[PDB]
Each structure stands twice: as structure tokens, then as C-alpha cells.
From Swiss-Prot:
There is a cross-link at residue 28 (Glycyl lysine isopeptide (Lys-Gly) (interchain with G-Cter in ubiquitin)). This is Peptidyl-prolyl cis-trans isomerase A. Interacts with protein phosphatase PPP3CA/calcineurin A. Interacts with PRPF19 isoform 2 (via N-terminus). Interacts with isoform 2 of BSG/CD147. Interacts with FOXO1; the interaction promotes FOXO1 dephosphorylation, nuclear accumulation and transcriptional activity. Interacts with integrin ITGA2B:ITGB3; the interaction is ROS and peptidyl-prolyl cis-trans isomerase (PPIase) activity-dependent and is increased in the presence of thrombin. Interacts with MAP3K5. (Microbial infection) Interacts with HIV-1 capsid protein. Changing residue 121 to F: 75-fold decrease of sensitivity to CsA.
Length: 165
């Protein structure tokens, strides 16, 4: 069975930048993948549509998914509060990897990050659950609006998102 695809349309201060699409490894992290997918379609009554990438660090990663507080301190899963770290089967192999952000062990919410480089020190600490499929060049574009402390020089938002088919 083929893995789900989702898309984000990214804007930079209201201006469309482009689209990023992701394959979600429902086959290897089924629960973590379904959370991100459901959050992307908004099908549970809430989700990523309209939220921001609040922390972007060049040559490191782009983090977003805090749709309730817009700065890293909020978010929630479709399972309630927070959910457990499902496995560390997939590794931070390189750029385009999509991984759950977390507060501690088994504190997975709605927050996620997209690698812009290999991030092996996170192998075993963050649950990898997908990868960029199209538009890695758009993440690279996003990346130039970050800084060493992550604060972004312009506002980066998910203008729209959903499931491709």
C-alpha cells in the first residue's frame, strides 16, 4: 500500500513562495504519520493550515506545527495532548527528513521539523516519520529567512495544506 502524500503552500509575509510535498511513512511509523496527515487535512477540526514556521536555523532545520501558540510552546496531536515516541527505526539521514519535535521522551504533539542537513545526533531522540518528496528547493528558500538563533527575518506560514489525492 502506497504511503500518503501531503503538501504545504508556504508564504513569506503574505507572498506565495512555493509548495513543499512530503511522503509520510505510514508503513513504518503509522501512528505518527496519521497525526501529521490529519493535522494537514484539518479533518479533525484543527491543524496546520495558517500556522507558521517559527524557528528556522540555516544548515540545520526548519521547525513549525505550533498552531495553538505560534512560537514553540503549544500544539496538540489528534490523540489528545501528547503521544509517545513510536520508534527510532528511521534515521536522520540527510536533508528533507521530517521529524517530530518534542519536549522530552514521549511528548510528541503537533510540532515537527524538516532537516536541511544530516542530523545524526538526533537519531533515537526524535521520531522520523517522513521526507520531503517535492520542493526541497522551497525549504532551501525558507532556510535563508532563519538565523543562528532561529528567529526568522520574515514571517513564514503554511498558507494552505492538505493531502495530494
Amino acid at each position: 500500500m502506497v504511503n500518503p502524500t501531503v503538501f504545504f503552500d508556504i508564504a513569506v509575509d503574505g507572498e506565495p513562495l512555493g509548495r513543499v510535498s512530503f511522503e509520510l511513512f505510514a508503513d513504518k511509523v503509522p501512528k505518527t504519520a496519521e497525526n501529521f496527515r490529519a493535522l494537514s487535512t484539518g479533518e479533525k477540526g484543527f491543524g496546520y493550515k495558517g500556522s507558521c514556521f517559527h524557528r528556522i536555523i540555516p544548515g540545520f532545520m526548519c521547525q513549525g506545527g505550533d498552531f495553538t501558540r505560534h512560537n514553540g510552546t503549544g500544539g496538540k496531536s489528534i490523540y489528545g495532548e501528547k503521544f509517545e515516541d513510536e520508534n527510532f527505526i528511521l534515521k536522520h539521514t540527510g536533508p528533507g527528513i521530517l521529524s517530530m519535535a518534542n519536549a522530552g521522551p514521549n511528548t510528541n504533539g503537533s510540532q515537527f521539523f524538516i532537516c536541511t542537513a544530516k542530523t545524526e545526533w538526533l537519531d533515537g531522540k526524535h521520531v522520523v516519520f517522513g521526507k520531503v518528496k517535492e520542493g526541497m528547493n522551497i525549504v532551501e528558500a525558507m532556510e535563508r529567512f532563519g538565523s543562528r538563533n532561529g528567529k526568522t527575518s520574515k514571517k513564514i506560514t503554511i498558507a494552505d495544506c492538505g493531502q495530494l489525492e
